CSV table of C-alpha atoms in Angstrom, one decimal:
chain,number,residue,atom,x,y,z
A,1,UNK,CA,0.0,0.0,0.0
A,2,UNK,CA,2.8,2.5,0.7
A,3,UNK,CA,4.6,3.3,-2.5
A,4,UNK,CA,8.8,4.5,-2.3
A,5,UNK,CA,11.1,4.7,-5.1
A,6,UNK,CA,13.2,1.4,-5.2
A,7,UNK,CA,16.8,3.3,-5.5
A,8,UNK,CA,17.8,7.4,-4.1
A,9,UNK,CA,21.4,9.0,-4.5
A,10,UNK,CA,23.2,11.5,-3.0
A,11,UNK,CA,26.0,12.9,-2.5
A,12,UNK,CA,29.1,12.5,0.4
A,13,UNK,CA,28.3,16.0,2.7
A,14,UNK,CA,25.1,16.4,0.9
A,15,UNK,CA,21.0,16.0,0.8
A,16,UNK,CA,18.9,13.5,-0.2
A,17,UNK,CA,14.9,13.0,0.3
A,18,UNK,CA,13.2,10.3,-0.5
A,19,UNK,CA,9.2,10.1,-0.3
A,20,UNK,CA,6.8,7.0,0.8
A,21,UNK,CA,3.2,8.0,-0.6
A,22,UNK,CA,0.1,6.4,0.8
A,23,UNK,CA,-3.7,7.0,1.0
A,24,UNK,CA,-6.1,9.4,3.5
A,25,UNK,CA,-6.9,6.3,5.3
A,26,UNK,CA,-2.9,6.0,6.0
A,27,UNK,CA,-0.5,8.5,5.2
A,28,UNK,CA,-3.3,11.4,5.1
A,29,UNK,CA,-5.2,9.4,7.6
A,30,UNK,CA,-2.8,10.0,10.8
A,31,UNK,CA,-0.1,11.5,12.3
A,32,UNK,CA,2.2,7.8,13.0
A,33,UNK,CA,4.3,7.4,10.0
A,34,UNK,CA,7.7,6.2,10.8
A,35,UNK,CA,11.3,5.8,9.4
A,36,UNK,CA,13.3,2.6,9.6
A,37,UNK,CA,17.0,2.4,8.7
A,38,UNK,CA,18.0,-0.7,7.6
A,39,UNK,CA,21.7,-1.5,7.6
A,40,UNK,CA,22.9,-4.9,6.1
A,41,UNK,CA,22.0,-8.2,8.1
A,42,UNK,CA,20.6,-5.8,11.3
A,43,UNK,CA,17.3,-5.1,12.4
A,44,UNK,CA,15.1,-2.4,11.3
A,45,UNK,CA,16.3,0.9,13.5
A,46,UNK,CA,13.7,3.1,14.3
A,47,UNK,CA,15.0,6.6,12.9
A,48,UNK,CA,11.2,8.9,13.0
A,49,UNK,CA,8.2,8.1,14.3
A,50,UNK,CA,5.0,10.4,14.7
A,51,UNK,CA,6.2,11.9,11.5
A,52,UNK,CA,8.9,13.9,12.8
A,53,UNK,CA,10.2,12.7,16.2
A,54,UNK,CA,13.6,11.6,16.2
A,55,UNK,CA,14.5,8.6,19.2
A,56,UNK,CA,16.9,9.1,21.4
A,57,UNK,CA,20.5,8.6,19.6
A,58,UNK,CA,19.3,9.7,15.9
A,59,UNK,CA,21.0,12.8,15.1
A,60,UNK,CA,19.0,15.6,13.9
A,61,UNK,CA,20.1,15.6,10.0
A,62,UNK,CA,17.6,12.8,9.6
A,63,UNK,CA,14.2,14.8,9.6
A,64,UNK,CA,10.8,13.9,8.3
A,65,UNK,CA,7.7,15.0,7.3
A,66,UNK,CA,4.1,14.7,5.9
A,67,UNK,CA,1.6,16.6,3.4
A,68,UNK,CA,-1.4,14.9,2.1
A,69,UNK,CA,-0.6,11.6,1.3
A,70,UNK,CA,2.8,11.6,1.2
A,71,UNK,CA,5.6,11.7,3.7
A,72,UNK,CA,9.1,12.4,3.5
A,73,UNK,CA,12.5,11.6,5.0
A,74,UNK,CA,15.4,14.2,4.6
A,75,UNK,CA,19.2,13.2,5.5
A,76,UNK,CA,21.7,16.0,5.3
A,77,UNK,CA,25.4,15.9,5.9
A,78,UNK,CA,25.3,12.3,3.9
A,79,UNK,CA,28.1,9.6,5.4
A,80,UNK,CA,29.0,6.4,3.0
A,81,UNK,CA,27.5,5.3,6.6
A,82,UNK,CA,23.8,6.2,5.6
A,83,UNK,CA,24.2,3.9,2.7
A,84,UNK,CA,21.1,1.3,3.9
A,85,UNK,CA,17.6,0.5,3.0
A,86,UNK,CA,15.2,3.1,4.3
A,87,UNK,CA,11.2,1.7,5.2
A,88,UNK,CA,8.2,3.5,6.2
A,89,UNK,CA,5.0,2.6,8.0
A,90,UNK,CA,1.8,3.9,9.0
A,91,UNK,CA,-0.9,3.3,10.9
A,92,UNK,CA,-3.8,2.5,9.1
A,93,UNK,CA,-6.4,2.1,12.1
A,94,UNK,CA,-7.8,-0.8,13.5
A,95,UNK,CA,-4.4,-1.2,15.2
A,96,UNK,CA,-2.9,-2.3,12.1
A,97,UNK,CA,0.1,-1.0,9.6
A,98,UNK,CA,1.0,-0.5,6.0
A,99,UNK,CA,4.6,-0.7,5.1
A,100,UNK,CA,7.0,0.3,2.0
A,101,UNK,CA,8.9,-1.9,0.0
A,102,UNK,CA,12.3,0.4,1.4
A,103,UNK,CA,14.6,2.7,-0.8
A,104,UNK,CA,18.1,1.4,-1.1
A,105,UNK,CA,19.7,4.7,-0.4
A,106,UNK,CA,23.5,5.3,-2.5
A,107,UNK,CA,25.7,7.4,-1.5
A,108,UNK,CA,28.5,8.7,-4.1
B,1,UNK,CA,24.6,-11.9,13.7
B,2,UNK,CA,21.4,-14.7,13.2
B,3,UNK,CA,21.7,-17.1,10.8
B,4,UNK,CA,18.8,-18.3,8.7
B,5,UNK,CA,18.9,-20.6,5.7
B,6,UNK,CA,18.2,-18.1,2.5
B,7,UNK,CA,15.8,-20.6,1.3
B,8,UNK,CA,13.5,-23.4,2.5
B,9,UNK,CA,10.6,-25.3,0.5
B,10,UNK,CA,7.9,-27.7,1.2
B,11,UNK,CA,5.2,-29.5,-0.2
B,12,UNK,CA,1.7,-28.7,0.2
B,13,UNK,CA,0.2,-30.0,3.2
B,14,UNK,CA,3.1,-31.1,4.5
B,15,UNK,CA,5.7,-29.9,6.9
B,16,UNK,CA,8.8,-27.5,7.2
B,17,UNK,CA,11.4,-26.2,9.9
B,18,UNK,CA,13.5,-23.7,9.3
B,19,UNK,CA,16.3,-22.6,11.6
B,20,UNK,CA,17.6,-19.3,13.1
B,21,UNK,CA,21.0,-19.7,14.7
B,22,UNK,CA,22.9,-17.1,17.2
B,23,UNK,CA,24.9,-16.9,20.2
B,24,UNK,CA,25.0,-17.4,23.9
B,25,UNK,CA,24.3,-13.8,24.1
B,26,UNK,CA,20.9,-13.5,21.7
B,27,UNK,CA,19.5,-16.9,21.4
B,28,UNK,CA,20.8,-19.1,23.9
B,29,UNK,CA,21.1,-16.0,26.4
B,30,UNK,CA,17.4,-15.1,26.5
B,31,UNK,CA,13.8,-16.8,25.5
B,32,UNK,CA,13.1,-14.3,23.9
B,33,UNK,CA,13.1,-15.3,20.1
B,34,UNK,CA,10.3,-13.7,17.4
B,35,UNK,CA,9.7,-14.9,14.2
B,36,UNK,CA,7.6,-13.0,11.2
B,37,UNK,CA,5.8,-13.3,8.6
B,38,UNK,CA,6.6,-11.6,5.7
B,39,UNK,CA,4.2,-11.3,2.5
B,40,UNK,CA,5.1,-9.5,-0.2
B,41,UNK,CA,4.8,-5.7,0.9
B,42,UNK,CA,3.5,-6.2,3.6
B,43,UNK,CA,4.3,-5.5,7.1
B,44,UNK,CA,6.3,-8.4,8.8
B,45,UNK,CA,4.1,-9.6,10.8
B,46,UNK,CA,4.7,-11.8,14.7
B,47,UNK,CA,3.7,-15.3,14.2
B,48,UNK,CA,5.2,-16.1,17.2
B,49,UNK,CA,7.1,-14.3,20.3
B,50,UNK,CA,9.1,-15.5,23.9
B,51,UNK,CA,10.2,-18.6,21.6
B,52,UNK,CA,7.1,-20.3,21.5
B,53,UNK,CA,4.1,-18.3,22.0
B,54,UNK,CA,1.6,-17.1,19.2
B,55,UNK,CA,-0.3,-14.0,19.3
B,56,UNK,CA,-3.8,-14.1,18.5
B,57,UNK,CA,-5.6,-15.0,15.9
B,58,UNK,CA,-2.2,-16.8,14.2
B,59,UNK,CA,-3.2,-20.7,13.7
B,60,UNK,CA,-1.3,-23.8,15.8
B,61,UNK,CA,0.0,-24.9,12.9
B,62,UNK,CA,3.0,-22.2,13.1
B,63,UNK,CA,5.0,-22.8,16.3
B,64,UNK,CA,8.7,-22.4,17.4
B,65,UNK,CA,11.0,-24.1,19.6
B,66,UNK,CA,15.0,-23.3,20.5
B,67,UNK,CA,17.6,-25.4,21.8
B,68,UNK,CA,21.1,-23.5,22.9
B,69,UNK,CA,22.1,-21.6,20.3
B,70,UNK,CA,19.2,-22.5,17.8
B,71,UNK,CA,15.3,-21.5,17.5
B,72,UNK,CA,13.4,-23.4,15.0
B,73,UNK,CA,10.2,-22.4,13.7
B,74,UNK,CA,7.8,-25.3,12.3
B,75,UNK,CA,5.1,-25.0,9.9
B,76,UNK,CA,2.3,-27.5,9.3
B,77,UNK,CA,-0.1,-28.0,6.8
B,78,UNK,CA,1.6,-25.3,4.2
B,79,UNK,CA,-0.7,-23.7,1.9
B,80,UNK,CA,-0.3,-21.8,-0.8
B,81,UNK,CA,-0.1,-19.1,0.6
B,82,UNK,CA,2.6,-19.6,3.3
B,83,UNK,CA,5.1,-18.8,0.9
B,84,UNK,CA,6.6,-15.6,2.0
B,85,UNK,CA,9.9,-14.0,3.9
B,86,UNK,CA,10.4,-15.5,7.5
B,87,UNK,CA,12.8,-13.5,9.8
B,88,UNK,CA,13.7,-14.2,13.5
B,89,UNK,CA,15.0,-12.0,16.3
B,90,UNK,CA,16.2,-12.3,19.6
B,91,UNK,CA,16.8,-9.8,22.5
B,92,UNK,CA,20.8,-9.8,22.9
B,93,UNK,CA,20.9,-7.5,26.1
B,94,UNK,CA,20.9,-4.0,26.6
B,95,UNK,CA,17.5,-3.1,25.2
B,96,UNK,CA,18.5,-4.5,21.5
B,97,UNK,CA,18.0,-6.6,19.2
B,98,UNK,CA,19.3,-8.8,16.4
B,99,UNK,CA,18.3,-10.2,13.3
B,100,UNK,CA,18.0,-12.9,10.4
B,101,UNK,CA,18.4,-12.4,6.9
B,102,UNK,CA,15.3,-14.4,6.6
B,103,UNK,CA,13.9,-17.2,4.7
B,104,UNK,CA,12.3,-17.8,1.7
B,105,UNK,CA,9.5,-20.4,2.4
B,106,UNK,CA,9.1,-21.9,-1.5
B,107,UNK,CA,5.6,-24.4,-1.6
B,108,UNK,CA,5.2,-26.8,-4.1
């Protein structure tokens, strides 16, 4: 249900954003999408949640956000380190979620 | 850090384990393996949790055992539609968690 782009590049030192776009019953529906980095062979790491609330640990050049339908994860100051798959997730109600199929993030 | 077979395969109605292997510090430290269910783009979802418990409303014919260093999680009666990702996870201390690679359940 949640669509991201397969593949994002950026830059060493720079910007990337990468988008994860749902429905109003999702995405537009609530305020509880949330960011997963994925390094290789680790668990999913919790990087936003609530749209743009970083955990304890996550430096603040990973932000996020949301408009309609779509949300948004923006990582500045880009380290060969980000290199991973990034996920999102929303709630959908019913205490259910809706997941991406991740952006393998490259970093050049 | 967990080790899971890439791929495992089973016939129709019939049977299949599949293995998830760790250390004395994850899986032989703690009962406190998770496995999930992954469909294609979908969430992964808990089929089972503390080793061998299911949450509701998953069937008895998923359930998981672990012996030292090993979980196992069985699957009976495959249908069609077990075929999908399986992951495991354990606790290793300190609030985190590791990770398989996962499975790929092929039926025939």
């Amino acid at each position: 249900a949640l669509t991201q782009p397969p593949s994002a590049s950026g830059s060493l030192g720079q910007s990337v954003t990468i988008s994860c776009t749902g429905t109003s019953s999702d995405v537009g529906g609530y305020n509880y999408v949330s960011w997963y980095q994925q390094h290789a062979g680790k668990c999913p790491k919790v990087i936003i949640y609530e749209v743009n609330k970083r955990p304890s640990g996550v430096p603040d050049r990973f932000s996020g956000s949301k408009s309609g339908n779509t949300a948004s994860l923006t990582v500045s100051g880009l380290q060969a380190e980000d290199e991973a798959d990034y996920y999102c997730s929303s709630y959908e109600g019913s205490d259910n979620f809706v997941c991406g199929t991740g952006t393998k993030v490259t970093v050049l």
